[PDB]
Design an enzyme around this catalytic site. Structure first.
Site, PDB file in Angstrom:
ATOM      1  CB  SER A   1       3.013   1.894   6.219  1.00  0.00           C
ATOM      2  OG  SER A   1       2.959   3.263   5.942  1.00  0.00           O
TER       3      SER A   1
ATOM      4  CG  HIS B   1      -0.509   0.600   2.423  1.00  0.00           C
ATOM      5  ND1 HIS B   1      -0.121  -0.129   3.523  1.00  0.00           N
ATOM      6  CD2 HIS B   1      -0.245   1.906   2.697  1.00  0.00           C
ATOM      7  CE1 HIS B   1       0.346   0.710   4.451  1.00  0.00           C
ATOM      8  NE2 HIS B   1       0.248   1.941   3.986  1.00  0.00           N
TER       9      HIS B   1
ATOM     10  CG  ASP C   1      -0.380  -3.425   3.101  1.00  0.00           C
ATOM     11  OD1 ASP C   1      -0.034  -2.915   2.019  1.00  0.00           O
ATOM     12  OD2 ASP C   1      -0.499  -2.796   4.197  1.00  0.00           O
TER      13      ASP C   1
END
Ligand code: NA
Ligand code: NA
Lengths: 250, 10, 26, 5
Positions: free
Chosen positions: A198, A43, A99
């Site tokens: 992330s 992502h 992801d």
């Protein structure tokens, strides 16, 4: 990271900085698993809803960093990519299930005191460590609060939480390729990854061979360090064979 | 608020 | 894959300051 | 990364 600490020099030899050429922003975190491959959250590249869709030469990979901002002149390595591989079934429309993406650096990087690959778990390894109550470690340069930016790499050690609790903390559909970690509003400590983290690594230390294993990839959380809310990480061991398959398949 | 990076990189 | 032994800690038998937290929960 | 849909 929120309610973290600064990382000691060389504490996270495998921590990578995903960076856009233009503007010159830090996109996300990442990790070095070979001398040719970086592993991140899908992502970070691809997220249609925010019109995100990066390519090979939109990004650069900066290994060996410690300072978030500064070009650490003799310490760090800046590498060009050669091919981003997203999981075939990354679910960007519903809950960000799978992801995970792989990067093939233009050329191998050379290890150092400050640059070094993290291991990928094996079944027995994922199987003896990925247990609720056990702490893992997250690293990154993301916001310091939900809502400000660190000088140096941040670090925070969190507990793995039993899936029932993760599930009952969100209205989002939690899949098997996901695990959650953090403290409950009551255990008295806190911390959690946040925006900018992330793609980053969730790693554990083997009590058996004293090695470091990446068990997760910082994925998502509703906010950063909110009470009765946990962070969600991609289950690397469950997406294992896919990972092997691309390194070898290519 | 980054420091320029050598163009070798772009 | 000489993976996961850090040059500046494990390899010199030096510990970082919060790695004992980790190990104590196992 | 900031869920609540
Ligand atoms: Na629920
Ligand atoms: Na929390």
């Amino acid at each position: 990271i929120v309610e973290g600490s600064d990382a000691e020099i060389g504490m996270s030899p495998w921590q990578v900085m995903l960076f856009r050429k233009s503007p010159q922003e830090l996109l996300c975190g990442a990790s070095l698993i070979s001398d040719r491959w970086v592993l991140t959250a899908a992502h970070c590249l691809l997220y249609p809803p925010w019109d995100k869709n990066f390519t090979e030469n939109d990004l650069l990979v900066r290994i060996g960093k410690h300072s978030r901002t500064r070009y650490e002149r003799n310490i760090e390595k800046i590498s060009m990519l050669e091919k981003i591989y997203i999981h075939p079934r990354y679910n960007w429309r519903e809950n960000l299930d799978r992801d995970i993406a792989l990067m093939k650096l233009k050329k191998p990087v050379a290890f150092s005191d400050y640059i070094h690959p993290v291991c990928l778990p094996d079944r027995e390894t994922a199987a003896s460590l990925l247990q609720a109550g056990y702490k893992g470690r997250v690293t990154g340069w993301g916001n310091l609060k939900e809502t400000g930016q660190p000088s140096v790499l941040q670090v925070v050690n969190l507990p793995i939480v039993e899936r029932p609790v993760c599930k009952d903390s969100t209205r989002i559909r939690i899949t098997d390729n996901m695990f959650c970690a953090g403290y409950k509003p009551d255990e008295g400590k806190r911390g959690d990854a946040c925006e900018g983290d992330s793609g980053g690594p969730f790693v554990m230390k083997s009590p058996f061979n004293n090695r470091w294993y990446q068990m997760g990839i910082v994925s998502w959380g509703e906010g950063c360090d909110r009470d009765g809310k946990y962070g969600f990480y991609t289950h690397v061991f469950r997406l294992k064979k896919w990972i092997q398959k691309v390194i070898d398949q290519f | 608020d980054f420091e320029e990076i050598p163009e070798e990189y772009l | 894959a000489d993976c996961g032994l850090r040059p500046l800690f494990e390899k010199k038998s030096l510990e970082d300051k919060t790695e004992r937290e980790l190990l104590e929960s196992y | 990364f900031x869920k609540l849909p």
